[PDB]
Amino acid sequence: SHMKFTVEREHLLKPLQQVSGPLGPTLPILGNLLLQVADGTLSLTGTDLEMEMVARVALVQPHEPGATTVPARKFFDICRGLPEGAEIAVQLEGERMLVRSGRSRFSLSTLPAADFPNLDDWQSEVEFTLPQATMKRLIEATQFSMAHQDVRYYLNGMLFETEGEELRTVATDGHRLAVCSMPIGQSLPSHSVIVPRKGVIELMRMLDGGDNPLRVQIGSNNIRAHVGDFIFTSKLVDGRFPDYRRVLPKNPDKHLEAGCDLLKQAFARAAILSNEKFRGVRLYVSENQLKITANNPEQEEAEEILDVTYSGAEMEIGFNVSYVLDVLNALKCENVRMMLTDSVSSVQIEDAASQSAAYVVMPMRL
Amino acid sequence: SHMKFTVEREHLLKPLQQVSGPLGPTLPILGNLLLQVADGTLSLTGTDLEMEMVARVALVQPHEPGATTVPARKFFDICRGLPEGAEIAVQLEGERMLVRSGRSRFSLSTLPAADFPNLDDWQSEVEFTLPQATMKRLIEATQFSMAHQDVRYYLNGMLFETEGEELRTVATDGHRLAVCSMPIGQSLPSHSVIVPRKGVIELMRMLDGGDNPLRVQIGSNNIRAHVGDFIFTSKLVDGRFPDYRRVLPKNPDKHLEAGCDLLKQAFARAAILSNEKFRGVRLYVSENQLKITANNPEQEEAEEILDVTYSGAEMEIGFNVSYVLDVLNALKCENVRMMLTDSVSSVQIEDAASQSAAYVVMPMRL
Lengths: 366, 366
Fold this sequence. Notes:
The structure holds 2 chains of a larger assembly.
Chain A: E1 4-8, H1 9-19, E2 32-38, E3 41-47, E4 51-58, E5 66-71, H2 72-81, E6 87-93, E7 96-101, E8 104-109, E9 126-130, H3 132-142, E10 158-172, E11 176-195, H4 197-205, E12 214-218, E13 222-227, E14 230-235, H5 244-247, E15 254-259, H6 260-272, E16 280-286, E17 289-295, E18 301-307, E19 315-320, H7 321-331, E20 335-340, E21 347-351, E22 354-361
Antiparallel strand pairs in A: 1-6, 2-3, 2-5, 3-4, 4-14, 6-7, 7-8, 9-12, 10-11, 11-22, 12-13, 13-14, 15-20, 16-17, 16-19, 17-18, 20-21, 21-22
PDB class: dna binding protein
Keywords: antibacterial drug, DNA binding protein
Entry title: DNA polymerase sliding clamp from Escherichia coli with peptide 37 bound
């Protein structure tokens, strides 16, 4: 085969950037993109073995079928570097891939397409289509709560759950937990899968913020997302993910309400004088009042006092201020509700006007 | 003394950010800002021993004189963290400095003002006032050409030269050189001083892009810049800086002209396939034409051909493409002129419509 194609720079740029996502090499070919020309289509694939991103570009100009792999970064940089409106002529020449446009000529090293990894075939168990904005809301509400390199490898990912008419995401690191559910206007079977850390990153990356809908297919060990001309596939993670229903506090009778921004700014200032490693803050809750205290090894001290909506019993509780700030930053709302039990129990935090997302933060011993 | 002052957050923020510039510690007090209250003025000083930045804030509210030093980053973060319009009440309490606003209270560790370094007094030999935009143009045209940790320590700085009615900057690393001169509408004595790397950075940092003029004072071993309520002082560097007059090519008879952007984009694409360490490109100049070639150890190759304005003798010359790209990026102009001699001689590069800046790049052996 003698692979050859000519494509407008503007039809090649966004696909190249998208398929280079899973990249960042061990096996040399993993640093390359797979290019395949067949029946009016150029396919571009990037992989890291755990996941793959494939883009399809319609070939309107004459072309000859074939396949090769080229260095991803170099090929994208060449194409991006060319002027707006450039026509990009690509051709395999022996073991080199030539890229030509105007009087610019580039000859790239290649690796055989036969060597390019290909995820095994599988059958879909559940399928649904939803707006990209729904998927973005779900991931952004919970992504920060995923563990970082925990031994319990399932915590390094994100749980994706279908139930009734809702899609839900759950993330936890064993100290704090985030859960968000959204209706997607279709009845679904109940299914729960764990998407790996990089998989969640790529899912987010392919959401261009437009009106092209997101079609999801879930298998027993794989997930696939289709947006426009892109198809992302990832392996799923093994493990018994914790059950958010059991993590939510049973009777968090003490309800505090406050402006989200005023609460966030008061914790952000207190954080300045918290211990740099442990990040501990002390909260003292009383009638319509919250007091936040932070101190560090140098005995420096921050104290903040806020007017809040609170009428229950007085109590003191310690938290890692970064976990609290992460929740407040993810809520991006007007008012927040904190639902407390006691000094040694978790707090549930929510947007006071929406039960779509719930956050559970375990306290620290004072 | 019992230092105490109350200032509006908006009058304290920009000075705090400005005086923290020289910071980034060995001696603990170097991580602190010196605060001094005396006769309606709060002075804030930051230093790294080689340079100091001092800001003066008028104290319109009652105050008590005194001095202390506080952690720079913590104090700025507290002040920045407070709400817009906040009134900031500061007071020394024993060995702590208290910062109060609304119901926010911070108690910071201190180090004695007596321990704070103070650059020795000196007398000015030359003084001139110029627009901030003139100083910005002079530094930006040459800063990239300064050496990085060269043994010849004077190359790690920037030469500032007064001559006639002009202020000039020169920077070189022994491989490439930049020189820029601007008229400043006042007759000056001829003086040449070397400002250290960090000094050039701080000079640039204090140019707020406004109409407050820059007053410069040069001594035998120090330089000082005054902009609004800020005063920057730096030690000068020892050494015999190279003489740009002798570095400029004597008879660069072969003149090439081209669009700056087209030339830059063609070198930027060729650079993709250049050796990652050596960055060598080969130029072949012929009648109204330039050809740029780059290759790497993997035998990949880029070739660019451009229509240029050229009528002299044919020649081939090698350059480090990063040195060429640095010049083109600093010129930000419509057309560029390259003045060549031979394959083993330097090239002089200039904006085709302005002789204000000149760049000299030594070639590489092909």
